[PDB]
Amino acid sequence: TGRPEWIWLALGTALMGLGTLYFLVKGMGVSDPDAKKFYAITTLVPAIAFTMYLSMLLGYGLTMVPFGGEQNPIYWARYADWLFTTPLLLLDLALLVDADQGTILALVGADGIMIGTGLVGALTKVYSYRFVWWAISTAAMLYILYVLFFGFTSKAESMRPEVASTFKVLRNVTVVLWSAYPVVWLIGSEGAGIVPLNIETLLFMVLDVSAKVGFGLILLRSRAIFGEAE
């Protein structure tokens, strides 16, 4: 409670934990193999985020990085979370549209580059270089968003209508929410430092819960997750 952002870390921990438990209960008894994949991916996402939020709340997922002549508090646990949860969210989208394996690898690999370069930027001690890493990570994000809109055209013709509808909604949620992350980083403690760490933590908490629990609620309530069966 010594760090003002503790309240948002505590709320994030609670919301990710509750979301995990809800998805775990909701997925009980699901037998359809396709739906099992979506429940597994979508329950793992907030479960991982729960552990990383808790690690930030308890102080383990925080480190001090010297730059700008200050000791800057950097929550590195965010990147350990996103390293696994962001490819999993992309996998949800890719499986919906029955993406080619090559497209899945392009997405997951670009996503690993996005998170890894974000982590390097977050830990870099030379201030100006932090924004070089931010730019590379943003380029990887833009590549991901490009694929989400322009890499699935060969699947549109054979796509079930409920699949197309749910994918379109989830893709729009993804573009809007994922785009905000580089902005928050750029203006917050890890970039220019014009927004204080407590407001940055609040912003990432709203984004994370929306991108994980909100996204999951939309996906797991849809008929698109079930194979077409009589």
Ligand X SMILES: CCCCCCCC/C=C\CCCCCCCC(=O)OC[C@H](O)CO
What residue 193 binds from ligand X, ligand LFA, ligand OLA, none (CB within 5 to 8 A, per partner kind)?
A: ligand OLA
Question: How far, CA to CA in Å, does 136 sit from each of 116, 150, 221?
Answer: 10, 21, 36
CB of 41 to ligand LFA, least distance (A): 8
Cα 164 to chain centroid, rounded = 22
CB of 182 to ligand OLA, least distance (A): 9
> Exposure string (b/e) for 179-196, b if CB count within 10 Å is 16 or more?
eebbebbbbbbbbebebe
Binding to ligand OLA (CB under 6 A) within 169-228 occurs at 192-193
Binding to ligand X (CB under 6 A) within 102-121 occurs at 102-103, 106, 109-110, 113
Q: How far apart are CA 95 and CA 34, in angstroms?
A: 9
Of 87 and 151, which has the nearer Cβ to ligand X? 151
Residue 123-162 contact track with ligand LFA, rule CB under 6 A, x = bound? x----x--xx--x---------------------------
Residue 83 CB: number of other CB atoms within 10 A?
A: 18
Question: Which of 112, 159, 198, 226 lies at the binding interface for ligand LFA (CB under 6 A)?
Answer: 112
Binding to ligand LFA (CB under 6 A) within 39-98 occurs at 48, 51, 63, 76, 79-80, 83-84, 87-88, 91
* Residue whose CB is nearest to ligand LFA in the complex, by number: 17
Question: Which of 169, 180, 207, 217 lies at the binding interface for ligand LFA (CB under 6 A)?
Answer: 169
Contact footprint for ligand OLA (CB under 6 A): 131, 192-193
Chain positions contacting ligand X, by CB under 6 A: 15, 18-19, 22, 26, 63, 80, 102-103, 106, 109-110, 113, 136, 139-140, 143, 151, 209-210, 213-214, 217
